[PDB]
Amino acid sequence: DVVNHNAQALNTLVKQLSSKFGAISSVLNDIFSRLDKVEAEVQIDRLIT
Amino acid sequence: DVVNHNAQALNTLVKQLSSKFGAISSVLNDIFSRLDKVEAEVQIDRLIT
Amino acid sequence: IRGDEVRQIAPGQTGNIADYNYKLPDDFTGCVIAWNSNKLDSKVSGNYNY
Numbered sequence: 042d043v044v045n046h047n048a049q050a051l052n053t054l055v056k057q058l059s060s061k062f063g064a065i066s067s068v069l070n071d072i073f074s075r076l077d078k079v080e081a082e083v084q085i086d087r088l089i090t
Numbered sequence: 091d092v093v094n095h096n097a098q099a100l101n102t103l104v105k106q107l108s109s110k111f112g113a114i115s116s117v118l119n120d121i122f123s124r125l126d127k128v129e130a131e132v133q134i135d136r137l138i139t
Numbered sequence: 140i141r142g143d144e145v146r147q148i149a150p151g152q153t154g155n156i157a158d159y160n161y162k163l164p165d166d167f168t169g170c171v172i173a174w175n176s177n178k179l180d181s182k183v184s185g186n187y188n189y
Contacts, residue, residue, distance in 0.1 A: 078151045078165045086112035 064088050111136050145173050 061067050064084040065075075072084045110116045113133040114124075121133045140148065140156065147156040148171050150163045157163075180186050 082112065 062087050062090070111139070113137050140173075148173075 059067055064072065064087045066072055066084075067088070069085065069088070072081050072088075076084065108116055113121065113136045115121055115133075116137070118134065118137065121130045121137075124130075125133070144154065144156050146152075147154045148163065149157075150165050150167045152163075180189075
């Protein structure tokens with residue numbers, strides 16, 4: 042379990058890079074290119090949070 | 091370290107008042123004087139959170 | 140500005156006015172005012188001063 046609690050807790054974290062968190066996309070460059078700067082700085086703020 | 095850990099935790103808690111958290115300013119009176127209520131409430135919500 | 144391009148005076152926009160003529164900074168903090176000037180600029184022959 043000392044192995045199994047450490048391999049799992051990373052795999053939960055790394056897969057959290059695939060989440061949107063209410064934004065339109067999980068990819069930074071799609072938000073940077075498909076939106077205005079004042080709205081990209083809100084959606085990317087949501088992703089950062 | 092018991093002296094140090096309770097001194098680094100407080101000072102950091104001071105320095106995180108300089109963070110904007112995606113708002114237009116880290117000073118609340120500037121937000122309340124430069125914007126009207128409906129616009130400034132989002133910025134104050136971000137700072138409070 | 141010709142009225143069909145009055146929306147082009149905005150930060151973060153692309154157009155013939157917005158690129159070849161002038162650009163507003165993305166961090167611009169100010170105001171934009173527009174007004175009709177048909178009685179002062181529009182001529183029957185055509186105003187070539189602009």
